[PDB]
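ok so heres the complex, seven chains, lmk if somethin looks off
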Amino acid sequence: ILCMVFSQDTRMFQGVRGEINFLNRAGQLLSPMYQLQRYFLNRSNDLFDQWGYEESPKASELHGINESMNASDYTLKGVVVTRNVIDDETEKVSITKNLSLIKRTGEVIMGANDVSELESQAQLMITYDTPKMWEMGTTKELVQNTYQWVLKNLVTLKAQFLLGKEDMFQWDAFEAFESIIPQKMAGQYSGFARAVLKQMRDQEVMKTDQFIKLLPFCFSPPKLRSNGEPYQFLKLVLKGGGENFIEVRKGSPLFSYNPQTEVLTICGRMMSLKGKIEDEERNRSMGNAVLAGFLVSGKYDPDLGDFKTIEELEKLKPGEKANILLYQGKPVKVVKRKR
Amino acid sequence: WNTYGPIGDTEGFERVYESFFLRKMRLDNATWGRITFGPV
Amino acid sequence: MNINPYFLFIDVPIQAAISTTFPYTGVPPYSHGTGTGYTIDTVIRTHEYSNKGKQYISDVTGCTMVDPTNGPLPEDNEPSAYAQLDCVLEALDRMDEEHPGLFQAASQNAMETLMVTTVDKLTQGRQTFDWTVCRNQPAATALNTTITSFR
Amino acid sequence: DYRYTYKCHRGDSKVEGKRMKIIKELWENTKGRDGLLVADGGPNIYNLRN
Amino acid sequence: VTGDNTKWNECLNPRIFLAMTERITRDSPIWFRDFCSIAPVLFSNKIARL
Amino acid sequence: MDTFITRNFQTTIIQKAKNTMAEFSEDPELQPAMLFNICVHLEVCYVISDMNFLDEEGKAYPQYEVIEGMPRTIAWMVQRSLAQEHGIETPKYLADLFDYKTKRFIEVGITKGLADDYFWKKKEKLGNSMELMIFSYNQDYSLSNESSLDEEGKGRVLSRLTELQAELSLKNLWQVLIGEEDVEKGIDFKLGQTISRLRDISVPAGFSNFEGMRSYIDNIDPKGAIERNLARMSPLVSVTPKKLTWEDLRPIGPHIYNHELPEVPYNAFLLMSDELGLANMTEGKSKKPKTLAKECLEKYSTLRDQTDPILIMKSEKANENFLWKLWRDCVNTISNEEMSNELQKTNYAKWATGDGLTYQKIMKEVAIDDETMCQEEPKIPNKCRVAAWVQTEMNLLSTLTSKRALDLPEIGPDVAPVEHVGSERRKYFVNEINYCKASTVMMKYVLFHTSLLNESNASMGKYKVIPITNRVVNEKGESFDMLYGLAVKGQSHLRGDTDVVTVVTFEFSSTDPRVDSGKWPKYTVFRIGSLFVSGREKSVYLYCRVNGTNKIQMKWGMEARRCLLQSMQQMEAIVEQESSIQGYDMTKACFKGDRVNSPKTFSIGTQEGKLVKGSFGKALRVIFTKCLMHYVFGNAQLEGFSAESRRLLLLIQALKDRKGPWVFDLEGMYSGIEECISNNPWVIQSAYWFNEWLGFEKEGSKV
Amino acid sequence: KDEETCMEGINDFYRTCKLLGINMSKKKSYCNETGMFEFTSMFYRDGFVS
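and the predicted structre for the whole thing:
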């Protein structure tokens, strides 16, 4: 079939019935020859019927073949079988931008569309280091890898963050992580993360757990409201729905923290953060790193009322105090701040 | 029982239910190809 | 903007558009009641399309019997149960001639299966009308009751 | 529907139940959390190929 | 033609089914012929319960 | 056993026996004894037909034709041809072997005891119309004719069968060896006098006894009978073919446009577009419905403490006072402390739902004697015109709200390309219809019906209060527990599942019924209080309605979650058609658009009488809303109308594709369709939309 | 050859099935050029099937 397609026989051209608008993985139109190749590979009966048959040669070893490779007198024109097997040393070749091999004189020897699409699983547990390709793995694996990368070099991230520039939200790991963030909410996620990190930096309540949790989301360009105030969220959802969500206040299956033992749980894997945690970090428990423009000022006061939803928090005015809930049994009292 | 029950010995379990393990092994060693829609 | 779901048919072939119209292949709960009235209507209609046949009195059960076969051919497009025997026999002859050795082989296979089968096969079925109590009972219970009565 | 009927929600979920306490303890004590059955609050892995 | 049949089961006659069974089993043991015929004759005398 | 079969016989023999026995239409595995018997028989007959040969005159140096092993059809036709060519009677049983010399069919058999009895009983079975040779494992032989087999064949067969017998007992297989007569035990079937009479009286007109019918069938040659019968048949028996045309199609059920008829009422179980949930933000824990309702009423304490009702509208028969007192009792029970949700003031509950007005059943004898007891006429459904509220229902239920109520579990990682395509389709579908109001309404419906079904577990003779609650999630992630009202379910003393158990439902709403008086001819509505959302007062009405449904209706409501799968299947069929036009998947291209393609757009509806297009997401939302409404508004009329509109739509499609459709009885189809348009709001609106779309197609086909 | 002869054949088939007791539904049947039709709740259309 590939021989028909490559020979450019007019019969092969006439043997096309349906549309051949096939697309490649990159989304770019295939070359016409490869389009016909793919169409006929998926459609073999049409070309075989259109080609026309003829009588097989009378030689002993030469015999014809049908559509289903059955020996017969009626054989595809110009096609014959032979028992006289024909027998089946290295050079260097240059490459170009489009991953196409071009010989010394310039002829193309191997294109990027000749790669068989036969997906399979390697028999050995291969490993890769580059984060640009983490997207191939599942969402949980991507989250685990990006958080491992953030944690291992946490010292450099903290050092650059204390400087206050913007070059530390564009690391390759963050670009890889952005893929699993829904497009519609990516801007709000990034804006909220940047606002909360800036608020934490300004007034020293630096919490390692919140910093690690909310650092990856800061890539995407900020998307603020018409009021110029950053959005507010309770939990940030990721692609895949359901379990794939990071809780901003208490903890999620993808991310949890145990301050009693100072243990970080990422996608069911446990690690120790000894040496990366300050003594005073525990005292400033959670309330200063859960909302933008809000800081803790007191404790649960039933008189002020029940807990206030994000809808009322967003419409609140500066200088007004409200009550929020971190998790079951740990309420807190916060106050809006201009800064 | 699944949490703190006695821990038995499962040696030779694959042999007893060998057909299912063979099916799983065949599935794992698959080489998926393309997907082609109706002729029309 | 008043939605019009049927407008989908403009942009999609109707064969695909109306795909899976009814999620249920079984029976709804609101179907017209199948009680004494419905069965009476069914028997009335069954006897109505065959009322031009031969009406007689069964000498075994003493019940009215209607036989439309080989009856007068219809003169109107209304439903008719008058099936001539000759036409059916000719159609069977044509089928047998087209498929030689088909009826014989099928009959032989059926008789062999019947010879090798067992009474338990009757238990694979839906509700069965038990005559001892004159009700609807599971297949196994009906078979057991019939066997006990026979014993 | 299966999880609702058998009260076998995920071991890492925040739901409460008579069976869910033991499920949560087993999930905490287990290392191979991908190998736990769904009936024991583990993760479902069923898909078309399997 | 995407034909449909109205009153399909209210028009077919058990006698015609008996004729079909007799024609099909024209070359078969007599006992099997009777066994096949016992069903159509039973149906031809069916009594409905209201 | 099977190991012995595959070891003692060549693969060809085993395959022939297996494929010949598999025609029995039964499992060949659980019963391999007959497989061994058939294999041995095949070997015996193969051996019998491998030593003797004939010639142009009959020199003994073939003579035996093998019939067994070959397909039953081919074997039977070959046997019939041999009988016809040799001018001999055809045995009624398929002979396993034929002889050219004796010009007779022959049969072979294998036994375990003496062969004399087996031969005699086979002779009784087949009479004298077939010859036979029989051999037994215990060195016994029987031949009808001594000039049939020679010494060599008999000796070889005897040696083979003796070897098989000896080898069987080595592996404990002779014990489980079944005989041969068992498969043919039943050969005697004598009909009794009664059954014979029934058969005789069950012949077509023209025959006296079944013997005449049998002879007529077995003798007469009916060739050419069809033409003779058709020639004299009246010409009036004609389908009357008629080529269809665009002008032939006309609007269906024009009476719906008759302004004289009343508007279609709102007969849905629960309010869909007019719902009003008393939001109460919660952490996410699961709590009993009674506690959730209690907390929700506590938050909106003003509505709970309302004791003076400002009646706004009343039903034709229902009593406002009784309904209000029942609602007060329900709220009192909800606000109490006892765990049970059981009403204790059964007075108003009993007297409000008309549960005491049921007729008393008396003995049939009195009714027969009585003259005033007569059957009542059937209350055929009334006829109603187009209802304007169904259009608003469809419009609003297809909108995107600020909350979603779907949280499905996870699935294993996708590897195969088909899994990736399915996952992409699921992602697009859920993203499109996650927040659609139809999804929330569907979840409320299914949850309420599930709670109703559960409450009928053990409480059947008692009144049960059930809050119409829902669990919802918004974009920000905070989740709310909405309460849409209450409903008290009465008792069903009868144990039947198809028996109506009256339930009266009080649902909150924010829409004044006076705006559309015709939308609520069946509801009793009060005014409880007023909520504040943005500092603005909005009234709250309590629609109270009596209803009757059975356990099967509860099951139907529970299954009403199948609308999700239905809509997904419809969307997948659309995508599959689009991809079948091409050779590759069209999911992302038809949703987002690739370089080659463009985002597919669907004609959604009408705006000021002009067509309007929209994204595939809007089409998906409309499909989901249509499926949900079809499930909610489902009755026999709806399913019948859909089944007949199927044929009408198919004919319209055939017209569109220039296939030249022909109709035989068009008015029959139109009558069948119009027979179902009586009072269902969904059916009437579907007829209206079908007429509009048919007009659009007519006006657009002339281009 | 032409649709007229096709409809004559359809009429002959209708009469024939009438002779055998099979009653075709004129109120639920239609005819169209081959390539698109239905068979037991399965719509076929130029290769596509639903």
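quick notes: Chains A and G do not touch (no CB pair under 8 Å). thats all i got rn
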